[PDB]
Subunit: 85 residues, 9 copies
């Protein structure tokens, strides 16, 4: 027979899946869009290369912070579930 934590943990795993699924959508498309501009800018001005890598890494850093903060809360959700009985 069920118990309250079976329901709480099921919610937690779905909740955690939503957090990382959305995190990977944000990060994969975000990084690809940042890389796109990098590849294009180099293609247009192949000596611009040096000055493009700082704006690129700032963008990626922002994108990846969302992925990583999401990851941390997915870890909280399934390894230390808030509201667990």
């Amino acid at each position: 027979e069920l118990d309250p934590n079976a329901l709480i943990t099921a919610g937690a795993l779905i909740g955690g899946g939503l957090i990382m699924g959305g995190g990977a959508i944000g990060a994969g498309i975000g990084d690809g869009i940042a890389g796109n501009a990098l590849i294009s800018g180099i293609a247009r001005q192949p000596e611009a290369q040096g000055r493009l890598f700082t704006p690129f890494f700032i963008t990626v850093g922002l994108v990846e912070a969302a992925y990583f903060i999401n990851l941390a809360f997915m870890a909280l959700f399934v390894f230390a579930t808030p509201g667990l009985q």
Copy 2:
């Protein structure tokens, strides 16, 4: 045997996952898109570097406010669940 808060807490965790999962989609894609204009603009005109960071950080400011306001409401949902019995 199930109790009311088990069900409410499972809903809270799924809602909190929706909130953060949508926040990361918006943040990563929004920031990548902004970053794509920054990188391209710098590639097109290297001395516009400083000029371009101002509208970039205004833009990133707005995208990031959506992410962290969502983060606050996810924390309300899972740490101070409204409707908990």
Copy 3:
């Protein structure tokens, strides 16, 4: 055991989650896209850019109204739940 409001509040948290999740996806990406144009236009026409912040704030105003109307209805769902028993 369960009671009706456990199920209703669970639906409310999940619906509130969809509402904020969707709101930040529209907001992050809508503002990113608006800011991309702002950044590019400032890169292209540094002088006559003041004429650009005004269409930008209008766009951002529309995008943010969607985010905050959604937020208002999330609050209603989870703090004044319609159909609560």
Copy 4:
């Protein structure tokens, strides 16, 4: 113990959340994409400004009609739930 309206109302709130979540995604990204073209067109031809505002407001009007019609049905779903017992 549960009752049929607890299940119906839970469905209604999720249903309503889906309607507004999707409404905000459509409206935020739609408006941002319309604003993008507005900001760009002004940047390219800063006297085009006058003739751009009619096509802009037609686009936004279309985008916002979807948001508003969605909002109306979310209101029906949770305040006058069809099929309520």
Copy 5:
């Protein structure tokens, strides 16, 4: 005590929300994208204004047909639910 139509009606309302929530994503983003070409085209060549509204309204016609055909099926789902017992 639950009855069959409570469950069926809850499914109907979630399905109807999916239908309209996806309709608004498609309508708002589709119409914004069409509107972006209209605005840009008018900005590029002001006297193409009349010429450009024809393919724009054909395009908006198609996007809007998806939105209102979805709206009809959402109404079938929630007002004349198939499978109701």
Copy 6:
């Protein structure tokens, strides 16, 4: 109390909803994107545009076939439910 078809019909309405929701997202946005090209190409080359309506209708034909095949399977799910008991 519940019977098996209540649960099956509920799954059917939710699955039918996903099918139409997804179909209108692909259709709204696919047609918007096709029409964006049509509008721009007519703006750029008003004379030789007749050659454009033909690739446009092919694209729209493909996009609409996805919408209407989906519609056909939504109808099957909700009017001739596979696995109904």
Copy 7:
């Protein structure tokens, strides 16, 4: 009263709806984006028409293979459900 296949079949129909909903999103937007480049390339070089139709049909073929393979598994899910009891 329920039976195991009522739950299995409900899962199957939702599962099947997810497969086709996502299939139509992939195919509608994919085909529209392929058609966009076709319409644009013809508009820019109206004699390029001949050499554009092979890359166009390769792209569409790839896009449509995802739709069709998804369709086949949705057919498996709801007409020959794996794990049916």
Copy 8:
């Protein structure tokens, strides 16, 4: 009367549908985007045809690997379900 594998199998089928539904979104849109550059590039310079197929198939290789690795895990979920009792 329900048994454990009925619930587990229903979860398996929904998870397997998520997996393939997300795979087709990524594959169709990813392949359309790659194909859009191929078509445009060939339109811009007809004799670059052979040159452009190499980076196109590398790109399509990567997009398609996501689709078929997802397909393998969907098959694991529904044909060899982990956790089946």
Copy 9:
């Protein structure tokens, strides 16, 4: 009848599904977008293209790390389920 792990494993398969679904959406589309730039840049600058594969593989590296970290957590959810009883 049911047992707690039936419900937990079901949540695990659904969460694992969200995680892989999201991962392939980010990966398909992120790599498509990166490859679009690669293809265009090679079409525009055939000589100095070697400088492009290096930003391309960096972008793809970031996009694929998101896909494969997600895959790693899907495996954890479905093969070493956190909170399993």
